[PDB]
Structure 1
Amino acid sequence: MRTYTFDQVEKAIEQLYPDFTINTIEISGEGNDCIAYEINRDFIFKFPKHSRGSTNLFNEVNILKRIHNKLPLPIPEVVFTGMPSETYQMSFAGFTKIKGVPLTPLLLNNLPKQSQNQAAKDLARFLSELHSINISGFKSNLVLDFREKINEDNKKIKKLLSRELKGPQMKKVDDFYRDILENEIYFKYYPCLIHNDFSSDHILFDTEKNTICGIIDFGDAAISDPDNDFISLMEDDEEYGMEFVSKILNHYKHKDIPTVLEKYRMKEKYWSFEKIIYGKEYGYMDWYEEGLNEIRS
């Protein structure tokens, strides 16, 4: 897990952009992949904390350029891009800072009844346009092969938990994976560009107009199952919950809501294993022990 002083950041930006004057630098936020630096109150510069994080930034940069001016909500524009180094496909990238505040569920539930409806409409329209973008031009490494991802997770779980689990516990896990891999609903979808981390923190809101005014953080974007962008909003009391997302789904003209719900229910059960895996890979032992505890039950 790499970290950066303010000096390193400025020094890095200077290599390719020695004429860019930095008047103010602050840390905007930090995620699993990147540390974000707000510069001049005008740009968000993301620096990766590890190789994989650098790869996601690279994809974010690539995708945002490709879909620039294709969407009905403002999205960040890519203005600076860092050079590769060793395993990092990209040492940093600087994006336009979009104005607005996260559309928190609290803030959503406090909106007048009709503003909530508009936000549901605006989200559906965004998602519908995004899921409609022609994907022919993208390279193959952007196609999330879900069947393969479950198989790889399965191998990771069987290795990680061989000594942590007793016979019956491992059988139920293996039962879980088998069931997934034998259920075509998870793999038989029409792939499309998806945001893939479509949740309230990444939805920017204008309390002046009472309308959504931005979508951010495409670092997880990929060619995958469009239902994923609804499921990521469905978690009641944490995200928007089933009631609101059903409005979105009905503006989006979704023909199969029971499928989306089935997918949600699987993802919910599946989080325990993500926690084991990500906990192990990112080195968060609170995450690992937490999933491991949930699995033991």
Structure 2
Amino acid sequence: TYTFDQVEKAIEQLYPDFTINTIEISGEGNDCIAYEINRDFIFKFPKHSRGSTNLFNEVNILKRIHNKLPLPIPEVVFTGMPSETYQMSFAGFTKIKGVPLTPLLLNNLPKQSQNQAAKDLARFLSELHSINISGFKSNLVLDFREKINEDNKKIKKLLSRELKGPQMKKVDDFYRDILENEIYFKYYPCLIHNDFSSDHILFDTEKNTICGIIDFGDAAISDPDNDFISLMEDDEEYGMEFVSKILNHYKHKDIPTVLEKYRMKEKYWSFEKIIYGKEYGYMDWYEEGLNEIRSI
């Protein structure tokens, strides 16, 4: 964690001409804390080394796709420096004014506004997924089969003395079932947002139109279907019906596939909670995942 004195000092070092008048905490994620500075900029500071690589990733991707997208995205204006601890010490982005398009907010909109929102997200995704990926930096590729095998290995290392025989057999089976299913690894890899959820979609209540996409730190080259299944959850997201509208504008050509990927992903969450948990020292996510795994 950081003091305001630390943030200001960090920025002053690299941007001595930049006058800081105001600084307040803007937000906080698992990877970075955000500061709003002079009410003009969002500055992200990594909470840890791992978070710093997401920050570093966001900056590189945003630089590459700048003015290629049909909706406003953060623009990099300030960058920090690498250390032995952080790949990037901080970054300052233009602030995009607006509020998040919550499930609540969306469902209260004129049926036309909802439909237009679905159209704007579709064409945003269409152009993003169309961006030319050759000449893209290292690390950017996220091969799904590589991910699952690596995860499987991790679950095995973590849970071998935590599960009983029948319970681990269930784990093996699930991972077996995933890996022997071609549709998961068959996609054309494209540049994807990879955390495309309602809290990263900023909305203009005056125009009743989406006015920005934020938080590219998870972006990668992978399965573009990821950017639909993330919006499709019923608890914290928009739901299968609204995403379906988005799918039509996208001109999507295998929607049951999208659906099959959604359901697999929802089941898979227990395992991510174990892994993401253990890695981020979230003993709460680990125990939840562990308890879920010891069940249905």
Shorter-chain TM-score range:
over 0.9
Task: Tell me, in whole angstroms, the C-alpha distance in 1 between the residues paired with 2:201 and 2:235.
Answer: 17
Task: Tell me, in whole angstroms, the C-alpha distance in 1 between the residues paired with 2:82 and 2:159.
Answer: 36
Provide, for residues 152-186 of structure 1, a one-character-per-residue CA deviation record: whole Å limited to 9, x for no partner: 11111111111111110000100011111111111
CA drift of 1:123 comes to 0.4
CA drift of 1:237 comes to 3.2
Matched position secondary structure for 1:141: coil
CA drift of 1:108 comes to 0.3
CA drift of 1:87 comes to 3.3
Matched position secondary structure for 2:231: helix
Matched position secondary structure for 1:234: coil
CA drift of 1:45 comes to 0.3
Provide, for residues 252-275 of structure 1, a one-character-per-residue CA deviation record: whole Å limited to 9, x for no partner: 000000000010011001000000
CA drift of 1:97 comes to 0.1
Matched position secondary structure for 2:230: helix
Task: Tell me, in whole angstroms, the C-alpha distance in 1 between the residues paired with 2:235 and 2:7.
Answer: 37
Task: Tell me, in whole angstroms, the C-alpha distance in 2 between the residues paired with 1:39 and 1:175.
Answer: 50
Task: Tell me, in whole angstroms, the C-alpha distance in 2 between the residues paired with 1:18 and 1:145.
Answer: 41
Matched position secondary structure for 2:187: coil
Choose which of 13, 16, 22 in structure 2 pairs with 1:15. Answer: 13
Task: Tell me, in whole angstroms, the C-alpha distance in 1 between the residues paired with 2:205 and 2:137.
Answer: 39
Task: Tell me, in whole angstroms, the C-alpha distance in 1 between the residues paired with 2:227 and 2:252.
Answer: 12
Provide, for residues 88-133 of structure 1, a one-character-per-residue CA deviation record: whole Å limited to 9, x for no partner: 1110000000011000010000001111000000000100010000
1:286 aligns with 2:284: yes
With normalisation by structure 2, the TM-score equals 0.98
1:236 corresponds to which residue?
Answer: 234
List gaps (5 residues or longer) in structure 1.
none
CA drift of 1:50 comes to 1.2
With normalisation by structure 1, the TM-score equals 0.98
Provide, for residues 208-251 of structure 1, a one-character-per-residue CA deviation record: whole Å limited to 9, x for no partner: 01000000000000000000000000001310000000000000
Task: Tell me, in whole angstroms, the C-alpha distance in 1 between the residues paired with 2:189 and 2:173.
Answer: 27
- Alignment identity in percent? 100
2:63 corresponds to which residue?
Answer: 65
List gaps (5 residues or longer) in structure 2.
none
Note the aligned Cα RMSD (angstroms).
0.7
Task: Tell me, in whole angstroms, the C-alpha distance in 2 between the residues paired with 1:285 and 1:104.
Answer: 28
Matched position secondary structure for 1:204: strand
Provide, for residues 133-154 of structure 1, a one-character-per-residue CA deviation record: whole Å limited to 9, x for no partner: 0001202420102111111111
Task: Tell me, in whole angstroms, the C-alpha distance in 1 between the residues paired with 2:252 and 2:217.
Answer: 26
Matched position secondary structure for 2:45: strand
Task: Tell me, in whole angstroms, the C-alpha distance in 2 between the residues paired with 1:95 and 1:205.
Answer: 18
Extract structure 1 runs of 4+ deviating beyond 3 A.
Answer: none
Task: Tell me, in whole angstroms, the C-alpha distance in 2 between the residues paired with 1:140 and 1:56.
Answer: 13
Task: Tell me, in whole angstroms, the C-alpha distance in 1 between the residues paired with 2:35 and 2:18.
Answer: 15
Matched length: 295
Matched position secondary structure for 1:41: coil
Task: Tell me, in whole angstroms, the C-alpha distance in 2 between the residues paired with 1:261 and 1:39.
Answer: 41
